Amino acid sequence: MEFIKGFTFGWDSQKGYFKTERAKESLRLMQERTASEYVIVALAALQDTAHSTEVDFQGSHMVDDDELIELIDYAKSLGLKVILKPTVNCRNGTWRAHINFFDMDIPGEPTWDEWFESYINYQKHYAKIAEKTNCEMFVVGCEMVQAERREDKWRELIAEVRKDYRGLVTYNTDKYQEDNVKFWDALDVISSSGYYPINDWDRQLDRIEAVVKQYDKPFFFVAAGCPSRSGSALLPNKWDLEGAINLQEQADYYQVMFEKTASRSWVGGFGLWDWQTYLYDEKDATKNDDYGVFGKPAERVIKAYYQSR
Ligand SMILES: OC[C@H]1O[C@@H](O[C@H]2[C@H](O)[C@H](O)[C@H](O)O[C@@H]2CO)[C@@H](O)[C@@H](O)[C@@H]1O
């Protein structure tokens, strides 16, 4: 696997967003400012709670199929390769890592089989879209920590995706959970959300390396990044962390991440988190405390590193 110079796009999208000129302008700027060669198109269906069984990919929160295909085609017209990442959020705000059901099927209770039926039907539809648009890679799940123990069901889902899509298939585990997944043999690429502290890369990379060596598969950090916020460099996954604006802390985080991972031949790339569809005005970048790097010192750090690889 070539080194993946990637950037996540579309997380903020809602139905209709991908029809707009400003979505195209934002993607053009993502490529120009970062020298990314892959875009990770990250989308989120909705379910009501962490313990309900219906996965909705048709409502106002989700781009329509026609505009999604339009955006994917436009990305390819720019020379980008495309990784499609359809995941799921909860309407009550619970992180999807907590999605979970009783081990047993209890009368009148929601079951694992019910949830997986709805989630499989969701994944198969977007796998067909990934096939039609020739996406380079497809991500069947994201940070589903408590669901990862249902090995048999994840294998069933992956086999369903294989019937619809001929490209590379991966699953995105959460930080520290790279060994929690036992179905890596059924996938083409291992990936995780590499939200590791600025001062702990050595221990975490050594741990992941040993996991990755157990399988014969390439690896990359399909999500990674850090807000421009004081304190974020120690807990970069924490999107709701409280702290003052700090552009330099974000740049320092990226500098260390790239320096530490560059010497690991098995770290095969990044899907940096994240580049918004409705991008803030560049004049507001020095006051933006979010993950975005547009107009911030980390933008130049990323572009320089991607151009070196
Ligand atoms: O899921 C809604 C929340 O997403 C947050 O971004 C997370 C994302 O869920 C996923 O965990 C990814 O790997 O890291 C992102 C940054 O931590 C935020 O966008 C937040 O506003 C959202 O409600």
- Cβ count near 110 (within 10 Å): 17
Contact 45, 89 (CB under 8 A): yes
Distance CA(82)–CA(133), nearest Å, equals 9
- Please state the domain count of the chain: 1
- Cβ count near 241 (within 10 Å): 15
| Ligand 1, atom 1: closest residue by C-alpha | 89
Closest CA to 219 of 181, 269, 271: 269
Q: In a mutational test of the pocket of ligand 1, which residue from 7, 8, 11, 221 has the highest number of ligand atoms less than 8 Å from its CB?
A: 11
User: Residue 156 is encoded by which pair of tokens?
Assistant: 């069933």
User: Residue 75 is encoded by which pair of tokens?
Assistant: 């990305």
Closest CA to 174 of 263, 238, 253: 238
273 touches ligand 1 (CB under 6 Å): yes
- Residues found in the chain: 309
Cα 118 to ligand 1 centroid, rounded to whole Å: 22
Distance CA(280)–CA(299), nearest Å, equals 14
Q: Is the four-CA dihedral 296, 282, 74, 119 of positive or negative sign?
A: positive
Contact 92, 48 (CB under 8 A): yes
Contact 223, 286 (CB under 8 A): no
| Ligand 1, atom 4: closest residue by C-alpha | 239
Closest CA to 98 of 51, 37, 158: 51
Distance CA(139)–CA(147), nearest Å, equals 15
Cα 239 to ligand 1 centroid, rounded to whole Å: 6
Q: In a mutational test of the pocket of ligand 1, which residue from 239, 241, 288 has the highest number of ligand atoms less than 8 Å from its CB?
A: 239
Residue for token digits 């399909």? Answer: 222
Cα 44 to ligand 1 centroid, rounded to whole Å: 10
Q: Which atom of ligand 1 is nearest to the CA of 236?
A: 17
Residue for token digits 């996938």? Answer: 187
> What DSSP assignment string belongs to the chain?
---EEEEEE-TT--TTGGGSHHHHHHHHHHHHHH--SEEEEEEEEEESSTT----B-SSTTS--HHHHHHHHHHHHHTT-EEEEEEEEEETT---GGG----SS--TTS--HHHHHHHHHHHHHHHHHHHHHTT-SEEEEEES-GGGTT-HHHHHHHHHHHHHH--SEEEEEE-TT-TTT---GGGSSEEEEE----TT-HHHHHHHHHHHHHHTT--EEEEEE---SBTTTTTSTT-TT----B-HHHHHHHHHHHHHHHHT-TTEEEEEEEEE-SSPPPGGGGGG--SS--TTSHHHHHHHHHHHH-
89 touches ligand 1 (CB under 6 Å): yes
Q: Which atom of ligand 1 is nearest to the CA of 12?
A: 19
Cα 72 to ligand 1 centroid, rounded to whole Å: 22
Domain that holds residue 259: 1-309
Residues 6+ apart with CB under 8 A from 6: 36, 37, 38, 39, 40, 83, 220, 222, 269, 270, 271, 272
Cα 213 to ligand 1 centroid, rounded to whole Å: 29
CA 180 to chain centre: 18
CATH at residue 65: 3.20.20.80
- By the 10 Å C-beta count (0-12 exposed, 13-18 middle, 19+ buried), 69 is classed as middle
- Cβ count near 52 (within 10 Å): 17
- Cβ count near 292 (within 10 Å): 22
Cα 248 to ligand 1 centroid, rounded to whole Å: 22
Method of determination?
A: X-ray
- Cβ count near 217 (within 10 Å): 17
Q: Which atom of ligand 1 is nearest to the CA of 172?
A: 13
221 touches ligand 1 (CB under 6 Å): no
**Crossing angle of helices 297-308/21-34, nearest 10°?**
60
Cα 96 to ligand 1 centroid, rounded to whole Å: 10
143 touches ligand 1 (CB under 6 Å): yes
237 touches ligand 1 (CB under 6 Å): yes
Contact 197, 236 (CB under 8 A): yes
User: Residue 205 is encoded by which pair of tokens?
Assistant: 């990379």
